[PDB]
Amino acid sequence: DAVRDPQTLEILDITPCSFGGVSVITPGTNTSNQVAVLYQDVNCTEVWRVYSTGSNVFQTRAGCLIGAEHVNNSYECDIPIGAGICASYQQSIIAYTMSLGAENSVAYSNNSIAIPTNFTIS
Amino acid sequence: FTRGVYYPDKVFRSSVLHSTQDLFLPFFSNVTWFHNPVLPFNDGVYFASTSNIIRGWIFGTQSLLIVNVVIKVTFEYVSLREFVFKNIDGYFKIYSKHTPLPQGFSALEPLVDLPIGINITRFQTLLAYYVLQPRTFLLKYNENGTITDAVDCALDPLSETKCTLKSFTVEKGIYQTSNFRVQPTESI
Amino acid sequence: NQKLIANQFNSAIGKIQDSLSSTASALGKLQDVVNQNAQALNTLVKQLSSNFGAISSVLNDILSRLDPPEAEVQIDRLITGRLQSLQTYVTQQLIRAAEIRASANLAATKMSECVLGQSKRVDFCGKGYHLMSFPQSAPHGVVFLHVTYVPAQEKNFTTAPAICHDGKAHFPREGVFVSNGTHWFVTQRNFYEPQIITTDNTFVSGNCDVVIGIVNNTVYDPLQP
Amino acid sequence: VTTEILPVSMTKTSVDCTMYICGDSTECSNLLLQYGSFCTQLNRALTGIAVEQDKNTQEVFAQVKQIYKTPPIKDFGGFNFSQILPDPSKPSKRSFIEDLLFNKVFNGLTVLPPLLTDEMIAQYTSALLAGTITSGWTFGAGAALQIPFAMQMAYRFNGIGVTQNVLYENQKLIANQFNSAIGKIQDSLSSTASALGKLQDVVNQNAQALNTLVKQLSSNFGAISSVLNDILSRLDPPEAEVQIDRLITGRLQSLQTYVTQQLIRAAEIRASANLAATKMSECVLGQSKRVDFCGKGYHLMSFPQSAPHGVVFLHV
Ligand SMILES: *[C@@H]1O[C@H](CO)[C@@H](O[C@@H]2O[C@H](CO)[C@@H](O)[C@H](O)[C@H]2NC(C)=O)[C@H](O)[C@H]1NC(C)=O
Ligand SMILES: *[C@@H]1O[C@H](CO)[C@@H](O[C@@H]2O[C@H](CO)[C@@H](O)[C@H](O)[C@H]2NC(C)=O)[C@H](O)[C@H]1NC(C)=O
Ligand SMILES: *[C@@H]1O[C@H](CO)[C@@H](O[C@@H]2O[C@H](CO)[C@@H](O)[C@H](O)[C@H]2NC(C)=O)[C@H](O)[C@H]1NC(C)=O
Ligand SMILES: *[C@@H]1O[C@H](CO)[C@@H](O[C@@H]2O[C@H](CO)[C@@H](O)[C@H](O)[C@H]2NC(C)=O)[C@H](O)[C@H]1NC(C)=O
Ligand SMILES: *[C@@H]1O[C@H](CO)[C@@H](O[C@@H]2O[C@H](CO)[C@@H](O)[C@H](O)[C@H]2NC(C)=O)[C@H](O)[C@H]1NC(C)=O
Ligand SMILES: *[C@@H]1O[C@H](CO)[C@@H](O)[C@H](O)[C@H]1NC(C)=O
Ligand SMILES: *[C@@H]1O[C@H](CO)[C@@H](O)[C@H](O)[C@H]1NC(C)=O
Numbered sequence: 001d002a003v004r005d006p007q008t009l010e011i012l013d014i015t016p017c018s019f020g021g022v023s024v025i026t027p028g029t030n031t032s033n034q035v036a037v038l039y040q041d042v043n044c045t046e047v048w049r050v051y052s053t054g055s056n057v058f059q060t061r062a063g064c065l066i067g068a069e070h071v072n073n074s075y076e077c078d079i080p081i082g083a084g085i086c087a088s089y090q091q092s093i094i095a096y097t098m099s100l101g102a103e104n105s106v107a108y109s110n111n112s113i114a115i116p117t118n119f120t121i122s
Numbered sequence: 123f124t125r126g127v128y129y130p131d132k133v134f135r136s137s138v139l140h141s142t143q144d145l146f147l148p149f150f151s152n153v154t155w156f157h158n159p160v161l162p163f164n165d166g167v168y169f170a171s172t173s174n175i176i177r178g179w180i181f182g183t184q185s186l187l188i189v190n191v192v193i194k195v196t197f198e199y200v201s202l203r204e205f206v207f208k209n210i211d212g213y214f215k216i217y218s219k220h221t222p223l224p225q226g227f228s229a230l231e232p233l234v235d236l237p238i239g240i241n242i243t244r245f246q247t248l249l250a251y252y253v254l255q256p257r258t259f260l261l262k263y264n265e266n267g268t269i270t271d272a273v274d275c276a277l278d279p280l281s282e283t284k285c286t287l288k289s290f291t292v293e294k295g296i297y298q299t300s301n302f303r304v305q306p307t308e309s310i
Numbered sequence: 311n312q313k314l315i316a317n318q319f320n321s322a323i324g325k326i327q328d329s330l331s332s333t334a335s336a337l338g339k340l341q342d343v344v345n346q347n348a349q350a351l352n353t354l355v356k357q358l359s360s361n362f363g364a365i366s367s368v369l370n371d372i373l374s375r376l377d378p379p380e381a382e383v384q385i386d387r388l389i390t391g392r393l394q395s396l397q398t399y400v401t402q403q404l405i406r407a408a409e410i411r412a413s414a415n416l417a418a419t420k421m422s423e424c425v426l427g428q429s430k431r432v433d434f435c436g437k438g439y440h441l442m443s444f445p446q447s448a449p450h451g452v453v454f455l456h457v458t459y460v461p462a463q464e465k466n467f468t469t470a471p472a473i474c475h476d477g478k479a480h481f482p483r484e485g486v487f488v489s490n491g492t493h494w495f496v497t498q499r500n501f502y503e504p505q506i507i508t509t510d511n512t513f514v515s516g517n518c519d520v521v522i523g524i525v526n527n528t529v530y531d532p533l534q535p
Numbered sequence: 536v537t538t539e540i541l542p543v544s545m546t547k548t549s550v551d552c553t554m555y556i557c558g559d560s561t562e563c564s565n566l567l568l569q570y571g572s573f574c575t576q577l578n579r580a581l582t583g584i585a586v587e588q589d590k591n592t593q594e595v596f597a598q599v600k601q602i603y604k605t606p607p608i609k610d611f612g613g614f615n616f617s618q619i620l621p622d623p624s625k626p627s628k629r630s631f632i633e634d635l636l637f638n639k640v641f642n643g644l645t646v647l648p649p650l651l652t653d654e655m656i657a658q659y660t661s662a663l664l665a666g667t668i669t670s671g672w673t674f675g676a677g678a679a680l681q682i683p684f685a686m687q688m689a690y691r692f693n694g695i696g697v698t699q700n701v702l703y704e705n706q707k708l709i710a711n712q713f714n715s716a717i718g719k720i721q722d723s724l725s726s727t728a729s730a731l732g733k734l735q736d737v738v739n740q741n742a743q744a745l746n747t748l749v750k751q752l753s754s755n756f757g758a759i760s761s762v763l764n765d766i767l768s769r770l771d772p773p774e775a776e777v778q779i780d781r782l783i784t785g786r787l788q789s790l791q792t793y794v795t796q797q798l799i800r801a802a803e804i805r806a807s808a809n810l811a812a813t814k815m816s817e818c819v820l821g822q823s824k825r826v827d828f829c830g831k832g833y834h835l836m837s838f839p840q841s842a843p844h845g846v847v848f849l850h851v
């Protein structure tokens with residue numbers, strides 16, 4: 001990974017080329033025909049033309065996602081991508097940060113209890 | 123749109139999904155319409171037509187002459203219409219189908235082979251008419267044994283997903299299809 | 311509450327009937343085994359059409375085109391290339407059988423403990439407080455129908471851990487001391503049913519200056535006449 | 536108070552079959568297709584491992600539906616949970632014991648990232664403590680119901696056969712015994728004693744396997760050289776055949792040995808990640824009667840903490 005110039009003797013470096021991988025996120029073909037394509041960690045500068053350039057370019061820790069719109073929602077996960085990113089089709093494909101569950105708090109105190117009154121057979 | 127699908131082999135099959143690495147016409151490509159010089163013969167030429175206008179074809183760079191019923195080059199062989207011309211391995215292949223561009227799907231049944239081995243670089247017709255690439259398809263057969271659908275495996279990534287799973291329905295999920303790697307530009 | 315429990319159980323069995331008679335395919339664990347076995351067999355079938363560097367993938371044309379001096383060189387590559395595929399198939403089947411045996415031992419444990427008795431293990435025989443279960447069969451599998459018990463419709467109260475009466479503490483037998491604001495009652499821990507605090511459902515220990523959070527009340531005595 | 540360490544998941548990988556055997560050799564791509572499909576098996580096995588790791592982390596932690604929160608008035612009848620409950624002044628959501636635990640521990644090789652990040656795992660384990668403290672075991676079988684803490688602990692004594700007049704007459708002694716035992720955990724983990732030995736052998740055995748798979752790229756296996764391209768620029772193409780056929784048949788066996796011994800190693804993580812799923816249900820979400828399952832002695836309660844590819848219990 002490093003080697004001297006034989007003629008002018010400047011020390012120069014070697015690192016390999018891109019070599020990622022491709023993934024094709026898709027809903028059911030009995031619902032739509034639009035896909036969103038994820039490349040494996042190539043930082044979105046080194047890229048079929050709508051799925052190669054244009055808008056909707058988004059940088060994940062999983063890679064370079066092209067063809068889905070980043071929102072400010074948090075939903076139950078539908079299709080996994082990685083690092084807490086999930087994609088779904090709600091009309092186009094959106095990508096977001098997955099949520100863990102509904103926020104809740106319990107009224108704790110040193111003198112109260114909550115006895116139930118009815119039941120349910122499940 | 124979706125035209126120019128033929129039978130690459132003389133082997134019968136039924137109800138299968140066989141992939142084929144052969145020379146075909148791509149889907150949704152631009153064909154030149156002519157409402158008539160000697161057009162170049164790249165590796166194989168698609169051709170259609172409309173009553174009693176189109177007679178024949180002049181081939182060759184010994185130049186080949188077909189009328190419609192043959193002239194030599196040294197051998198003579200006297201025996202909406204779509205045709206496929208191919209110069210394969212020193213043979214010469216013609217495929218055919220006629221029905222009453224339209225937007226359906228119709229296969230092309232084989233017509234003739236010629237064991238000649240001649241040299242052809244450009245072609246010309248003998249008086250509407252319409253004027254191949256290395257591809258890979260996914261041919262769907264039926265009960266009687268005819269092609270009912272095909273999918274080009276290099277058009278859009280949904281078709282590449284359908285060609286990887288060898289299926290025509292892809293359920294919800296994420297699928298790995300291919301790999302990519304940039305090429306060296308120059309030598310040093 | 312026998313009639314209410316009976317109608318709730320009947321409605322629950324009916325909803326399970328509907329959720330399985332619909333086209334919701336929940337037999338994914340039973341389907342994946344069949345898919346994996348069929349796909350391994352199809353790969354083992356399609357390995358026969360490989361040539362592995364030889365001149366043909368069929369043995370017969372090699373035998374009919376060559377002589378036993380130089381046909382054996384062609385046959386040896388095919389023999390090694392087919393042995394390796396057999397060995398790979400057998401090794402991965404031996405790995406899958408262990409997963410199937412682990413699932414069968416878990417199913418035998420559930421059949422012994424959920425069906426043939428009541429369980430105390432939390433979230434083993436269904437998510438809830440467990441009552442009983444019912445086995446059903448399936449192709450290469452088993453299906454249980456766990457009958458749980460989920461409480462509902464809670465309501466705040468004010469509680470206290472003891473009762474000082476005459477310089478003595480008073481703890482319940484089994485239950486909490488609750489209050490609606492005015493009175494004080496002992497009630498069981500999972501279904502609201504208040505009662506009158508007597509010496510039939512409490513006991514006594516020590517004097518009432520050690521307990522942290524004790525509350526004054528008056529203990530009724532059941533021997534009135 | 537004791538400590539119990541288990542592994543949960545391991546490193547997700549995936550190795551491309553073509554570039555490992557012969558990267559950038561267009562005639563070796565024709566030599567590999569004489570072997571049928573030995574490369575679509577190996578990618579299908581190494582994908583089945585990688586999804587299986589993201590199912591182990593789901594069933595250990597994600598067992599509550601909600602996300603409960605501790606109240607801002609932390610007054611629990613004498614006890615002190617400040618070592619295990621999170622404090623927001625740190626750059627993460629991570630608590631104090633878990634920071635002591637996060638310090639004690641290409642030729643085709645790619646490593647996928649996990650699905651649940653370490654700041655999502657650390658929010659599940661803050662929900663399990665916040666329900667165990669403020670609601671007893673009531674949040675395992677439905678919806679959480681509040682209860683005072685010294686009344687919760689009073690009839691966790693009533694399970695092991697000690698009547699509830701013992702705790703109310705000895706409340707401040709137990710609180711001093713309970714708070715003291717937590718501090719000796721924080722000493723014996725932050726000291727030079729290396730207790731995370733079980734989690735370290737998951738990580739070391741995944742590095743000995745990849746230091747060998749790369750090392751096999753320098754063995755000639757009976758050919759004339761180990762470098763693929765220098766065989767090509769030193770031979771005729773009908774005589775460069777039977778030199779690459781010793782490298783391809785060699786390098787297939789080094790992939791085939793790696794993938795199998797990853798499949799047997801991945802099966803003993805499910806045997807360990809299904810035991811941690813049981814101790815999360817039976818030790819944490821309820822009181823256990825199984826002898827020496829949750830601890831060593833009669834059992835009261837437990838508290839989960841996270842770790843890199845693992846979980847740590849604190850059986851009281
Ligand atoms: C029991 O009392 C508590 C405290 O009064 C109630 O908790 C509050 O409920 C309201 C209404 O939903 C919320 O807006 C507050 O945020 C809750 N308090 C806290 C501290 O979170 C509780 O709802 C009561 N239980 C019932 C069944 O009504
Ligand atoms: C417990 O819940 C059940 C519902 O699951 C209640 O049953 C209802 O009772 C009312 C009053 O008679 C009826 O009008 C409803 O039709 C009943 N529901 C059903 C589904 O039949 C029951 O009353 C609740 N218990 C209490 C004490 O309120
Ligand atoms: C708390 O519960 C007690 C027990 O039922 C209530 O006392 C009774 O209340 C009813 C009216 O709802 C009266 O008719 C009875 O005479 C009361 N019992 C006695 C012995 O006097 C009490 O009212 C409840 N607390 C509140 C604030 O309603
Ligand atoms: C709980 O009850 C006891 C018993 O009556 C109370 O103790 C007495 O309270 C009265 C009222 O001020 C005093 O005059 C007596 O001197 C107390 N007795 C003793 C022995 O100290 C006690 O105050 C009550 N507690 C509360 C909070 O009301
Ligand atoms: C719980 O324990 C922590 C640490 O053992 C206590 O925090 C210390 O409190 C003293 C006050 O007397 C401070 O001088 C220290 O600086 C604190 N240390 C830390 C690390 O915060 C905490 O006070 C205890 N809880 C209660 C309720 O007392
Ligand atoms: C790679 O990503 C980083 C952000 O992590 C960015 O700063 C950098 O500019 C990117 N590289 C290129 C060539 O744009
Ligand atoms: C998400 O929030 C940011 C706030 O910084 C805002 O700039 C952005 O427009 C929001 N996204 C959408 C889709 O509105």
Ligand SMILES: *[C@@H]1O[C@H](CO)[C@@H](O)[C@H](O)[C@H]1NC(C)=O
Nearest residue numbers: 137263264265266267268270
């Ligand atoms: C096969 O041909 C017969 C007669 O032409 C026809 O009746 C039948 O429907 C055909 N089968 C299919 C699958 O089209």
Ligand SMILES: *[C@@H]1O[C@H](CO)[C@@H](O)[C@H](O)[C@H]1NC(C)=O
Nearest residue numbers: 109110111522523524608610
């Ligand atoms: C409950 O706690 C509050 C402060 O948090 C305190 O003022 C009150 O006295 C306590 N109640 C009991 C019964 O100890």
